[PDB]
Amino acid sequence: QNLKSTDRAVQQMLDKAKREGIQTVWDRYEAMKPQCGFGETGLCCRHCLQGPCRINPFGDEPKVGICGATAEVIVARGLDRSIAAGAAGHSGHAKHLAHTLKKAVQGKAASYMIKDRTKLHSIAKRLGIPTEGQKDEDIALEVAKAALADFHEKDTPVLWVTTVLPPSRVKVLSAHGLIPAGIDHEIAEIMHRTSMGCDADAQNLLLGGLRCSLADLAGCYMGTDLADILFGTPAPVVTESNLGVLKADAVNVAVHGHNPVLSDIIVSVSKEMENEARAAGATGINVVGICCTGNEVLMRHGIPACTHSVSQEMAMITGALDAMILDYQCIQPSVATIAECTGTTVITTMEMSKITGATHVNFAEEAAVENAKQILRLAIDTFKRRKGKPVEIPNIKTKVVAGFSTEAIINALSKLNANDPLKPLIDNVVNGNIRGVCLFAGCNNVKVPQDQNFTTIARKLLKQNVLVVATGCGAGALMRHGFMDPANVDELCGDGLKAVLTAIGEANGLGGPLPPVLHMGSCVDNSRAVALVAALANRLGVDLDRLPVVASAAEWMHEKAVAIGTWAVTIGLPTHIGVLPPITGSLPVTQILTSSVKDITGGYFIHELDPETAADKLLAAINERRAGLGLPW
Amino acid sequence: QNLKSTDRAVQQMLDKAKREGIQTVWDRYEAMKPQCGFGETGLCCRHCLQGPCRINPFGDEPKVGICGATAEVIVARGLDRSIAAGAAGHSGHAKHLAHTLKKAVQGKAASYMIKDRTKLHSIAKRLGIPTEGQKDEDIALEVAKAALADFHEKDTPVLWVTTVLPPSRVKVLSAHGLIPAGIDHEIAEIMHRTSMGCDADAQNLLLGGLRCSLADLAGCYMGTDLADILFGTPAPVVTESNLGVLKADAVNVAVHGHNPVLSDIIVSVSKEMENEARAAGATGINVVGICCTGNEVLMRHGIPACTHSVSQEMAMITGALDAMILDYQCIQPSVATIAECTGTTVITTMEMSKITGATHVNFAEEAAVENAKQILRLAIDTFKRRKGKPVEIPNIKTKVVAGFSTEAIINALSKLNANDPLKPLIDNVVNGNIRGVCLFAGCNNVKVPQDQNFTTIARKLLKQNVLVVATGCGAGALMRHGFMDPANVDELCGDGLKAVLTAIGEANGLGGPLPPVLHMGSCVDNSRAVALVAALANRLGVDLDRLPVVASAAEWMHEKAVAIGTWAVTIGLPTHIGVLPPITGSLPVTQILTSSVKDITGGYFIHELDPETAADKLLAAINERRAGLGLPW
Numbered sequence A, B: 001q002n003l004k005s006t007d008r009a010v011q012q013m014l015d016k017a018k019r020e021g022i023q024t025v026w027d028r029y030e031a032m033k034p035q036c037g038f039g040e041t042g043l044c045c046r047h048c049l050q051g052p053c054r055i056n057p058f059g060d061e062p063k064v065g066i067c068g069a070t071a072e073v074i075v076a077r078g079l080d081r082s083i084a085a086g087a088a089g090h091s092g093h094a095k096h097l098a099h100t101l102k103k104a105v106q107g108k109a110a111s112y113m114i115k116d117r118t119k120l121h122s123i124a125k126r127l128g129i130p131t132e133g134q135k136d137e138d139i140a141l142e143v144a145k146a147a148l149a150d151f152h153e154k155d156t157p158v159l160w161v162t163t164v165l166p167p168s169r170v171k172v173l174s175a176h177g178l179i180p181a182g183i184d185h186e187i188a189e190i191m192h193r194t195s196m197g198c199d200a201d202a203q204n205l206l207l208g209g210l211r212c213s214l215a216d217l218a219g220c221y222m223g224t225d226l227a228d229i230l231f232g233t234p235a236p237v238v239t240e241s242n243l244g245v246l247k248a249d250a251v252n253v254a255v256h257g258h259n260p261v262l263s264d265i266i267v268s269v270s271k272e273m274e275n276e277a278r279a280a281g282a283t284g285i286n287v288v289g290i291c292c293t294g295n296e297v298l299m300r301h302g303i304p305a306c307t308h309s310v311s312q313e314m315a316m317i318t319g320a321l322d323a324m325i326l327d328y329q330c331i332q333p334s335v336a337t338i339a340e341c342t343g344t345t346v347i348t349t350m351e352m353s354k355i356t357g358a359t360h361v362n363f364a365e366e367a368a369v370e371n372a373k374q375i376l377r378l379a380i381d382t383f384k385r386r387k388g389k390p391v392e393i394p395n396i397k398t399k400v401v402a403g404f405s406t407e408a409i410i411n412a413l414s415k416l417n418a419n420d421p422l423k424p425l426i427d428n429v430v431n432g433n434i435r436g437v438c439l440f441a442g443c444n445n446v447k448v449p450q451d452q453n454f455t456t457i458a459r460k461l462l463k464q465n466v467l468v469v470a471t472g473c474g475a476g477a478l479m480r481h482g483f484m485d486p487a488n489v490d491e492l493c494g495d496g497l498k499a500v501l502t503a504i505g506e507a508n509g510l511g512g513p514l515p516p517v518l519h520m521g522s523c524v525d526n527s528r529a530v531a532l533v534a535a536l537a538n539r540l541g542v543d544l545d546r547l548p549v550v551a552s553a554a555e556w557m558h559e560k561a562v563a564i565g566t567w568a569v570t571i572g573l574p575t576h577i578g579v580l581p582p583i584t585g586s587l588p589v590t591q592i593l594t595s596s597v598k599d600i601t602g603g604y605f606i607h608e609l610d611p612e613t614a615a616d617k618l619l620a621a622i623n624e625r626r627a628g629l630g631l632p633w
């Protein structure tokens, strides 16, 4: 099972699933081999009913699509549609939060409120919304209206791009025509230009994709902003991760998906029903997190993280998961079928994301508490049905310190330098104690033994004094393998990095270091990493493509991650990816994305399937940035 | 060549292309056989990087996607993305026209203006925009702002749906949650819900697709409305069609694509440069139409139609096409390569639709006349380079009467009944002189011998007294085969239909009948057919799903046509399609689209590849509608 996942709890559940005859994502992957090479290389098009068209990577015909579309056009159109689909997910998430904030401040959903007033006021100031002499409710109404206005064309471009990046970066992007005009406007323009008989020039197509990736960045940043207003900005928290966080004697309830608009309410209400859970034979309600909704409630409330991404079915296989409460994105629809065998109640909550065979509860903000109680009572019923059944919860978990929002990181640094908090971090970059910064982001992917790339790359970078930050299922991989436990700083970190983590932690009263990797939150919270490095760029007076900062989507899968990787390149970062997207069928497109885009944005993709080689390539990229600043390396 | 196209001019050019070694769409189709059966059946998914996934239609594994997505989910997600892409094209077209109208009435593009004041005022009244005491420029500004507001969520739903359909139809759709909230909002929601780990219930997915198809209908109707304001509502015109409209001694200039925002200007300016063309050895500038931009200028100015859709390369093969001026949609990118062999200057004009190897001229409304002159002068240069070269223009053309906007049809009927113009048409439906109405719409498709389905079906329906209306490349097929020549009424039409066409034509002073088929314009002008049958429904006091009205997308290809076919079903029409979309891999999805959707909208798809059978099925559908009204059949 170690060829399937490097997580020992996951291996144990894979053995249970095998002896019980329950098919897993890994079994369905094996059943798909050999996968289609036209699709793997990108040389397939279904954009009209004259198709499907394909192109042989090498050899004889077919050499061109029926309409005349070349390999370069077919590959670029497919990639653009992936970016648009990712943008549509992150911005659908943000849009829902904008509507929730509007409802809350109009008096229409009393379960929601302005929890972070300081964040509200700073966002308003960032956007140019007046604060002086205005009620908080009116300021928030203005912020929500601004959020919704960024989805369509108006007199200004998308402010959740233009107000969040360094001004020199906005100027470079504007010169290339890359600033989005409206989030949904760009998504639709991608769908139009990639339809049959439309854009047929690879460079033109890819420039559009870069612009649409910035629409995705805007949705990410808007989602983080709005979730912080509504639910609180994260601050450092201590919790646990992996399947051992489930409790045989408790009602185990997983929140799963991405938008925490209901799961934050699930967390609050579950506490109020401890007595009702005790009447039914449980110690209480044990809410646990899967995927990014789990990251949201871990970051804000220290809810323990059960599992992530590719291994999500394994939580059910324990027999102890009484309910799995779904919103949208990254939910394997197999969970609805597996629930019959495991007894778990799978509940969908969003009108646009239903799964056949799952129970649906129509969540509405105005009725959020009622909804959480109806849902949680289905879970309590389920816990009672499994009275006196054996469960197999692997006794495996790690300690996790998390909650490193950008505000929290700046605050931690301020204990070393109150009036210039970024300076101690920059001081240590310049002197070599910190070699650079790497963001790990994105999913797991069944093609890669689970977590193998994240942990192999992270280990090498930490030994070379790289400050490592992580989001999404990259943070999930690292937390499940101990990278967020400060007890592992001695083992994992080079002496320079250890010195800095210790100095910061000791100034924060911890008597011990910050953890080896800083968890910055969910996938939308990749925007927090942008805010951090944008602040660093502005303090140094340079653009992001001169900083020793790189990213690695080491095991990526989702269209959302393709969008994130593309905006990382667009804002100027060397961006490693550990699974090839469907681009190898076009050498011209591959050359743009890995080389010549440098001349446009200063970023570039680094394609490397071997994680040891990937770490060497990321260190090389960091060290070239150091050299361009005149720093030793 | 008659297996490739039923058009004799196209056959002649296929022989020339073969002896000159020029590859055509038909050659590229042959080179693609056998096409992938997974893609043909819809059983392929590439929505994440764990793919590509496929499902065997029958037999052993693979049976399910890697994430657990079933065949039903995979097929429904793919179809939904096709509908969203079509909506993005039609509404991108409409959005561009909305911006053009706004620029014109703000004094920013003097080459554009309010040409149809009556249409402006009726659209304003339809939307609830006040007209009394307002300048036309301010009314138009309000209409343009309303058009742009329908792209995003607001306090009202999409008004270019809710104000254009019968109220009972709006109520049925609203009860099922099918009214779009915003055009680009729906496109993005489709992209989100169909991304990995999101919507996984076929019925839920398909309901979303029906809603997004109504966003497409809104874009079509908005595009027709705005183009009529800016360029004039069509009225009956007489012109010609087929390759014989090219002239060896003239500068032959094709306008090709969909948005006539520049080609209408091309038509005006070309007249002003007749003298400049005469200096270079030509008789003048002969502007001809390809595809829907050609339909737009045919409908408004009687510009002759050169060719359409699948056969567009053949116009170049004559050797006499000096320039082909492109905007977007349905342009085979092969034209840029074929131009090297034929001498044609291929010019792109829109930033989001470029073709490698074509010359680009950045069109801007503010500089429209300058742009048309720069473009037309490239064409005059090209005509001079082919001095003393042999050209092979097939001496083949038909007479075309066209320009039947809904306003023109109502006006023609008003000569029989001034105060109740629809009554004479209804009178003849009730008495059997008109059996019903069929709209032919959509593309040609290389899988079908060109025009064979349109003409075979139309011939049978006309003999059975069906009033036939046509748009897009369905109108192109019928015009090229004589169906728009009133001299063919005796041959083609049953006695009842002939009586009505003659009575209407004689009351309109023609001394002769209306043509056998009424050309209602471009693909967006399918909205005109909606306006006509909506008016008929309102006059009879019933909904569209009780009228003897059907549609046939007999040779369809583009994602835009998939969207149109889907909204035809959604508004209540039996809708024949002559090429199977990628749905046969899921029996549950096929059953929804061909049967059970009747219980939702009253419309349904009729899947029939055999055009003689299709005509029988369409007549059966018409006759069942007649029976439901108590009419003889």
Ligand code: SF4
Residues within 6 Å of the ligand: A045, A046, A047, A048, A049, A050, A051, A052, A053, A065, A066, A067, A068, A069, A074, A195, A196, A197
């Ligand atoms: S758009 Fe072109 S390449 Fe794609 S399926 Fe249609 S004919 Fe084939």
Ligand code: SF4
Residues within 6 Å of the ligand: B045, B046, B047, B048, B049, B050, B051, B052, B053, B065, B066, B067, B068, B069, B074, B195, B196, B197
């Ligand atoms: S979304 Fe599911 S079915 Fe589609 S490629 Fe990804 S794993 Fe395969």
Ligand code: FES
Residues within 6 Å of the ligand: A036, A037, A038, A039, A040, A044, A045, A052, A054, B036, B039, B044, B052
């Ligand atoms: S031929 Fe396999 S992905 Fe299309």
Ligand code: FES
Residues within 6 Å of the ligand: A036, A039, A044, A052, B036, B037, B038, B039, B040, B044, B045, B052, B054
């Ligand atoms: S396997 Fe051929 S279309 Fe994907």
